[PDB]
């Protein structure tokens, strides 16, 4: 699903403000053509046989 709420890592109540003990769970990849193998983006498809 989609969830953009702010993580509460510590035992401190916070809302809206991001920073210490208020983390954003969504972080992005970075892809450049000069990266090595292992940092290359690999397209993955699976199957759901039953």
């Amino acid at each position, epitope marked *: 699903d989609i969830s953009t709420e702010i993580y509460q890592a510590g035992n401190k109540p916070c809302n809206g403000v991001a920073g210490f003990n208020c983390y954003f769970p969504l972080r992005s990849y970075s892809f450049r*053509p*000069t990266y*090595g*193998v292992g940092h290359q983006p690999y397209r993955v498809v699976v199957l759901s046989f039953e």
Partner: antibody, heavy 118, light 109 residues
Framework: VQLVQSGAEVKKPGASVKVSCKAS????????IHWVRQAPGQGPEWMAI????????SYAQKFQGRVTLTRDTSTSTLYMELSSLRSEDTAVYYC??????????????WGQGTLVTV | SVLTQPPSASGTPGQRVTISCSGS????????VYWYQQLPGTAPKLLIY???QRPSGVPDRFSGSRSGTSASLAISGLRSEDEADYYC?????????????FGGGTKLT
């Protein structure tokens, strides 16, 4: 429809050396720019690939972070500022042109190069 | 990987020899190769595309091909003007870096 370099000379090791070449000719936003270094008596090593407009940059393993490049559109200048010069950093630089919106394919003609020695 | 090249290429005026670049897996057999010739005192110049056609126009006395993990270029009708250095360029896609790697160095005699 051509590229010419800039003049330079010998500099002290462990300093910053400014290198640049102009760019003119066709449209600018849809042609990637290659720079490549060549050492005398050996084979050349690939330096950088640059996307104009947003100024996208990418660097090789042996030069990641130790070299800095800047680019612009209206003035059409392409700068590197070399730092941490060794005796290995005495070579000739070339600025190039690519296919456009693609970093794979043949290389368009280079300039006259810039020689740097320590 | 490293793209080993012979140190020199012997020849006499008026005959055919082959100059080759031997590479590792996923460097020559994966992507295409590029042949380059460096005339002394001049900027280098492109001579071939992917080895099935000529870029703008050259007489067909030079022929390029691939074999497994290596690339070869057969040259004929050798002249004293064409004595230069030959280079090969390829996309490496190796571990920790995937730059435009080049070959070693050869001299035409």
């Amino acid at each position: 429809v051509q590229l010419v370099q800039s003049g330079a000379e010998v500099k002290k090791p462990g300093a910053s050396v400014k290198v640049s070449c102009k760019a003119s000719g066709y449209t600018f936003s849809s042609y990637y720019i290659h720079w490549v270094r060549q050492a005398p008596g050996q084979g050349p090593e690939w330096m950088a690939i640059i996307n104009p407009g947003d100024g996208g940059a990418s660097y090789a393993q042996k030069f990641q972070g130790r070299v800095t490049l800047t680019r612009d559109t209206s003035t059409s200048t392409l700068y590197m500022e070399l730092s941490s010069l060794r005796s290995e950093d005495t070579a000739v630089y070339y600025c190039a042109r690519a296919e456009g919106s693609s970093w794979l394919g043949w290389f368009d003609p280079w300039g006259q190069g810039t020689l740097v020695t320590v | 990987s490293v793209l080993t090249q012979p140190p020199s290429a012997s020849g006499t005026p008026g005959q055919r020899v082959t100059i080759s670049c031997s590479g590792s897996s996923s460097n020559i057999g994966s992507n295409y190769v590029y042949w380059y010739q460096q005339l002394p005192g001049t900027a280098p110049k492109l001579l071939i595309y992917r080895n099935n056609q000529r870029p703008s126009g050259v007489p067909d006395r030079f022929s390029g091909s691939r074999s497994g993990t290596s690339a070869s270029l057969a040259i004929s009708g050798l002249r004293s003007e064409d004595e230069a250095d030959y280079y090969c360029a390829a996309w490496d896609d190796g571990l920790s870096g995937s730059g435009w790697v080049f070959g070693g160095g050869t001299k035409l005699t």
